[PDB]
């Protein structure tokens, strides 16, 4: 009750009562001393921001703290070598939760697309944003995956519909 509350305080610098995007960012660690991915921060904020205030109050921050510790739980387990980074061999073991098993060097496309560190591995902040994009893509896929076998057959319009429904 105060545990979640005394986390909210230490992250609220200007004491306005709202965790700003900048506040949550520099109160977060990707584990590489580089600034936490602002795109990742912006996403987690807007997910639990309900009055457009581009931030979260204690009510809204509870969802944020839960949403971020649940991701650290995921990151902690698949980071078996415990280097603070998820490598390709550890990525295969991680992205298994999306249903269809993916090819081995499809994990080289994902790691090229979402790694900002550029060291051929995936950090915690980039891991969250990557899955956010991935979940966004699979919701679009599941609409046409009625068959439920990981394969869809769509038209030209439906394809364009899928592309422009990314937002």
């Amino acid at each position: 009750q105060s545990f979640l509350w005394n986390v909210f305080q230490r992250v609220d610098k200007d004491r306005s009562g709202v965790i700003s995007d900048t506040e949550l960012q520099q109160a977060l660690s990707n584990g590489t001393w580089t600034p936490f991915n602002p795109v990742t921060v912006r996403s987690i904020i807007s997910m639990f921001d309900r009055e457009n205030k581009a931030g979260v109050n204690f009510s809204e921050f509870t969802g944020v703290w839960k949403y971020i510790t649940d991701w650290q739980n995921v990151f902690r387990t698949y980071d078996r070598d415990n280097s603070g980074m998820i490598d390709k061999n550890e990525l295969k073991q991680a992205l298994s939760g999306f249903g269809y098993r993916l090819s081995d060097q499809f994990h080289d496309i994902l790691i090229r697309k979402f790694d900002r560190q550029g060291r051929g591995q995936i950090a915690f902040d980039d891991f969250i944003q990557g899955c956010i994009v991935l979940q966004r893509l699979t919701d679009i896929f599941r609409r046409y995956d009625t068959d439920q076998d990981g394969w869809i057959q769509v038209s030209y319009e439906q394809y364009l519909s899928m592309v422009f429904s990314i937002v």
Partner: peptide, 12 residues
């Protein structure tokens, strides 16, 4: 010696 992934509480 960077802070572990996620929320950083004071004292690293």
């Amino acid at each position: 010696n960077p802070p572990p992934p996620g929320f950083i509480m004071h004292g690293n």
